[PDB]
């Protein structure tokens, strides 16, 4: 399970903001699943200890 | 979108001009980061657009 | 003289309306 990441974990999460914005836009314009999961898992709660899993889920919505 | 640490640092400043200048600097840094992210996203979107319009025409045909 | 509120990653900007939701029920007793 390769999870190489840069030591500077400051600007890497900006693309996370863009990804979550895109996912929110897709679900709003194209409602596929309930939005309760989005409320439960919020990037601002710091509970995303595995951002790769969050990205995989977001892509799974694709 | 500055982190909570930046907000605490701003709150630490006592003199009104000092805190105002720190807030302006934080705004400038956030704007620069957002502009860099937007430019990178635009470049990536154009590179995807580098794919011929034949792709879109085939999508229409399907 | 009250226990510190568990922020739990719920920032509250000055003069900004915010909602706090903490899973722990202990705060319910205090409220």
UniProtKB/Swiss-Prot annotation, chain B:
Function noted in UniProt: ATP-dependent serine protease that mediates the selective degradation of misfolded, unassembled or oxidatively damaged polypeptides as well as certain short-lived regulatory proteins in the mitochondrial matrix. Endogenous substrates include mitochondrial steroidogenic acute regulatory (StAR) protein, DELE1, helicase Twinkle (TWNK) and the large ribosomal subunit protein MRPL32/bL32m. MRPL32/bL32m is protected from degradation by LONP1 when it is bound to a nucleic acid (RNA), but TWNK is not. May also have a chaperone function in the assembly of inner membrane protein complexes.
Top-rank taxon, per record: Eukaryota
Family (UniProt): Belongs to the peptidase S16 family.
Entry note about domains: The Lon N-terminal domains are crucial for the overall structure of the protein, maintaining it in a conformation allowing its proper functioning.
Illness: CODAS syndrome: A rare syndrome characterized by the combination of cerebral, ocular, dental, auricular, and skeletal features. These include developmental delay, craniofacial anomalies, cataracts, ptosis, median nasal groove, delayed tooth eruption, hearing loss, short stature, delayed epiphyseal ossification, metaphyseal hip dysplasia, and vertebral coronal clefts.
Coiled-coil boundaries: none
Quaternary structure annotation from Swiss-Prot or TrEMBL: Homohexamer. Organized in a ring with a central cavity. The ATP-binding and proteolytic domains (AP-domain) form a hexameric chamber, while the N-terminal domain is arranged as a trimer of dimers. DNA and RNA binding is stimulated by substrate and inhibited by ATP binding. Interacts with TWNK and mitochondrial DNA polymerase subunit POLG.
Organism the protein comes from: Homo sapiens (Human)
Expression sites by tissue: Duodenum, heart, lung and liver, but not thymus.
Intracellular or extracellular location(s): Mitochondrion matrix
Protein's UniProt name: Lon protease homolog, mitochondrial
Swiss-Prot record, chain C:
Subcellular location, record wording: Mitochondrion matrix
Tissue expression per record: Duodenum, heart, lung and liver, but not thymus.
Highest taxon, organism lineage: Eukaryota
Transmembrane portions of the chain: none
Job description of the protein: ATP-dependent serine protease that mediates the selective degradation of misfolded, unassembled or oxidatively damaged polypeptides as well as certain short-lived regulatory proteins in the mitochondrial matrix. Endogenous substrates include mitochondrial steroidogenic acute regulatory (StAR) protein, DELE1, helicase Twinkle (TWNK) and the large ribosomal subunit protein MRPL32/bL32m. MRPL32/bL32m is protected from degradation by LONP1 when it is bound to a nucleic acid (RNA), but TWNK is not. May also have a chaperone function in the assembly of inner membrane protein complexes.
Reported disease: CODAS syndrome: A rare syndrome characterized by the combination of cerebral, ocular, dental, auricular, and skeletal features. These include developmental delay, craniofacial anomalies, cataracts, ptosis, median nasal groove, delayed tooth eruption, hearing loss, short stature, delayed epiphyseal ossification, metaphyseal hip dysplasia, and vertebral coronal clefts.
Family: Belongs to the peptidase S16 family.
Domain notes: The Lon N-terminal domains are crucial for the overall structure of the protein, maintaining it in a conformation allowing its proper functioning.
Subunit structure as annotated in this protein's UniProt entry: Homohexamer. Organized in a ring with a central cavity. The ATP-binding and proteolytic domains (AP-domain) form a hexameric chamber, while the N-terminal domain is arranged as a trimer of dimers. DNA and RNA binding is stimulated by substrate and inhibited by ATP binding. Interacts with TWNK and mitochondrial DNA polymerase subunit POLG.
Protein's UniProt name: Lon protease homolog, mitochondrial
Boundaries of the shown chain within the full protein: 123 to 153 of 959
